[PDB]
Amino acid sequence: STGSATTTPIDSLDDAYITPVQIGTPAQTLNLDFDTGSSDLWVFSSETTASEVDGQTIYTPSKSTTAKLLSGATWSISYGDGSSSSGDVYTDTVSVGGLTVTGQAVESAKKVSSSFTEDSTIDGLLGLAFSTLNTVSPTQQKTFFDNAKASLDSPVFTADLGYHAPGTYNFGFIDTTAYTGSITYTAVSTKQGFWEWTSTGYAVGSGTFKSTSIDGIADTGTTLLYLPATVVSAYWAQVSGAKSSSSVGGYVFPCSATLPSFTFGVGSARIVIPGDYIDFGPISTGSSSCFGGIQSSAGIGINIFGDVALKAAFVVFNGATTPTLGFASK
Numbered sequence: 001s002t003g004s005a006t007t008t009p010i011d012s013l014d015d016a017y018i019t020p021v022q023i024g025t026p027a028q029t030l031n032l033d034f035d036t037g038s039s040d041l042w043v044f045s046s047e048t049t050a051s052e053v054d055g056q057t058i059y060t061p062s063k064s065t066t067a068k069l070l071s072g073a074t075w076s077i078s079y080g081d082g083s084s085s086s087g088d089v090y091t092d093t094v095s096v097g098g099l100t101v102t103g104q105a106v107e108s109a110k111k112v113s114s115s116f117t118e119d120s121t122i123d124g125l126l127g128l129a130f131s132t133l134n135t136v137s138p139t140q141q142k143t144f145f146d147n148a149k150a151s152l153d154s155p156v157f158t159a160d161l162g163y164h165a166p167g168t169y170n171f172g173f174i175d176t177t178a179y180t181g182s183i184t185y186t187a188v189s190t191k192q193g194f195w196e197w198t199s200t201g202y203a204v205g206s207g208t209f210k211s212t213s214i215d216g217i218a219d220t221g222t223t224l225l226y227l228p229a230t231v232v233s234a235y236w237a238q239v240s241g242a243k244s245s246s247s248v249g250g251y252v253f254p255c256s257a258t259l260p261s262f263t264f265g266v267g268s269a270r271i272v273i274p275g276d277y278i279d280f281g282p283i284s285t286g287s288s289s290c291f292g293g294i295q296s297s298a299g300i301g302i303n304i305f306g307d308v309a310l311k312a313a314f315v316v317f318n319g320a321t322t323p324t325l326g327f328a329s330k
Helices: 114-118 144-151 229-236
Strands: 003-009 017-023 028-035 041-043 068-078 084-096 099-112 124-127 156-160 167-171 184-187 196-204 210-218 225-227 243-245 250-254 262-266 269-273 279-282 289-292 294-296 303-305 314-318 324-328
Touching: 003 084, 028 041, 041 084, 068 099, 099 114, 099 144, 184 196, 196 229, 210 225, 229 250, 229 294, 250 294
Parallel strands: 028 124, 041 099, 210 303, 225 294
Antiparallel strands: 003 017, 003 167, 017 028, 017 084, 041 124, 068 084, 084 099, 156 167, 156 314, 184 324, 196 210, 196 262, 225 303, 243 250, 250 289, 262 269, 279 289, 314 324
């Protein structure tokens, strides 16, 4: 089997991407944030505290003939941005892009933090990291990918995120029309439950490439590119008037600037992030200070190749017995 679904930016900045997902029978379509940095499929639901719902579409298990309470199971998750959610668990039929899993754990939110409530466009998350990170207790649950894997034509999914445009998540096949050149594969460590890999270095603009190992994760659920302070300083030093602002919470730059590109290494291959991908616009409405898309990871504990980096590539998440990542230009 295979699946193919379009993923759409939630706003003009590509802050996140939503993908429609069918849950239950008859189908209830929710727009989920596919997150390769977490491993829970959770949704706004008929159980979510009413004051914490503001425009999201909810899953109502009582209206699904295939929903079953997963008795005794609870979940609770906290994300890198300080957001959180928790609740109970149903199993139900879940389809993505024509690929169907029966018996998928669908984590029904009873509580969500303010950032979720305030984002009306995101109806929940669909985690695509390794199932060792799933938070369901007392019986850990599998991701949609892990449950689909054995049925897929190839044990892979691909992320093809757009810049200010829709893109695609494919499951079970690699669309050889969706990228240019060849795919370079690189080793993955699953030790922390993430798609963790080591970049071979970077360049700023037309500068020379610096060969240096940068361990980090491929995370579709993180907007920005978070790298070591040395690398980030080197990038923003090439932008007149850029500075790190403790009041704003990262590097800002004059909105009048033209940003340089940023290149990262994948083995001997190179992925180039155009400068415009690194512009996240005014810090507040009407400001002439703009927020940068490359930020320091120093206060995180991990480097994160988030959407800024991933949307410059066609990315293969190879879930074979020995997982690997692949990157191609596009």
